């Protein structure tokens with residue numbers, strides 16, 4: 457079901473086996489490098505492997521998560537096959553100016569699992585140039601890049617916020633407003649797994 | 658404006674629209690501090706790297722990867738990882754490793770840890786295509802996106818600039834990296850023993866020892882080189898006045 461869907465939850469405790477399989481996963485984790493972070497072990501233990509059979513993972517990283525994110529990516533069963541960088545500009549397309557250099561960019565690892573078929577690889581390039589909006593707010597261009605890569609398929613975003621909800625996406629995060637599910641398969645499995653509407657441990 | 662959509666529409670990469678893309682006394686002190694350029698033709702595969710002395714404060718490592726020769730002796734990450742870089746690096750020192758845009762972003766990190774470094778910066782060379790927007794890109798089999806950048810990883814071991822370099826994509830068959838990487842490195846004021854492995858006649862530079870297979874001439878002499886750093890000059894940053 458095409459329109460945006462979301463689940464307010466602690467991603468550490470949600471049974472994500474109820475959500476089905478996804479063409480694309482994206483995560484912007486609160487790495488342990490205001491909000492609740494996850495320890496390195498909690499990150500490794502995330503049940504990302506159940507979310508896909510064949511498709512792509514987009515994993516935002518910074519600082520030492522550049523290495524930890526690669527570890528997680530490989531542990532969860534992905535091979536890193538691209539690395540998008542977002543060049544941060546102001547409204548006049550100047551670069552907004554790690555203790556050795558000033559940081560002009562953010563990194564999103566791209567992992568592949570299985571053998572995805574029917575994706576439109578090569579349509580976009582691996583550099584985003586876009587204005588910094590709010591704090592820790594990722595650029596909206598990533599959604600269009602992902603939509604051209606895999607149009608119309610099911611997608612899931614981990615550690616998203618209300619501004620991240622998108623058609624074709626299910627968004628998970630603990631600052632979302634309740635539970636809003638429209639896909640009938642997901643609704644059925646959610647009721648069965650959570651009959652009283654509560655996610656505990 | 659969505660420059661990603663625009664690139665899909667026109668072939669102009671989003672970095673084409675970045676604009677604008679005194680720390681000059683430091684550049685002057687660097688220039689006064691620099692040793693004479695030194696260089697050595699050496700087949701690094703067959704060469705005992707331990708003959709390069711003394712131990713270096715900075716190593717710039719630029720192995721010729723196969724991916725550099727798209728439409729054109731290449732070094733695999735197997736070869737590169739077996740270089741004994743830790744045997745010539747000083748206990749406190751820095752490495753700058755050109756990793757390309759594919760599996761090197763992972764294997765280059767394996768190399769850095771293997772040699773005893775931790776990664777502290779990831780410097781991205783972003784390539785514009787302002788002069789040739791139409792010319793598309795033949796993709797790596799595993800690629801999901803068109804690759805328009807290369808990464809230079811900075812590693813540290815022991816106790817003004819941005820992490821981006823933006824230039825026009827060079828002509829096919831041109832493997833040179835932007836000389837701006839030398840500016841970034843020298844502005845760090847890391848010490849004066851600087852080694853560029855797999856450099857060429859075209860990259861030879863004051864303040865650097867360049868070692869590489871295609872060099873046409875050599876002037877390297879280990880004793881002469883060491884004399885540039887004997888007391889009272891053992892510990893200069895390369896960013897201070899000469900010792901009278």
Ligand SMILES: CC1(C)CCN(Cc2ccc(N3CC(=O)NC4(CCN(c5cc(NCc6ccccc6)ncn5)CC4)C3)cn2)CC1
Pocket residue numbers: 465466467468484485486487490491492493494516517518562592593594595615616617628629630631
């Ligand atoms: C492109 C970039 C610039 C984007 C920013 N990145 C870094 C970055 C910054 C900030 C954030 N976030 C900010 C924010 O406010 N919230 C979250 C989303 C909701 N969220 C949780 C957590 C949770 N479990 C743990 C838990 C522990 C303890 C108590 C409760 C819960 N379960 C469910 N949702 C907490 C994080 C997102 C994410 N990444 C760099 C690149």
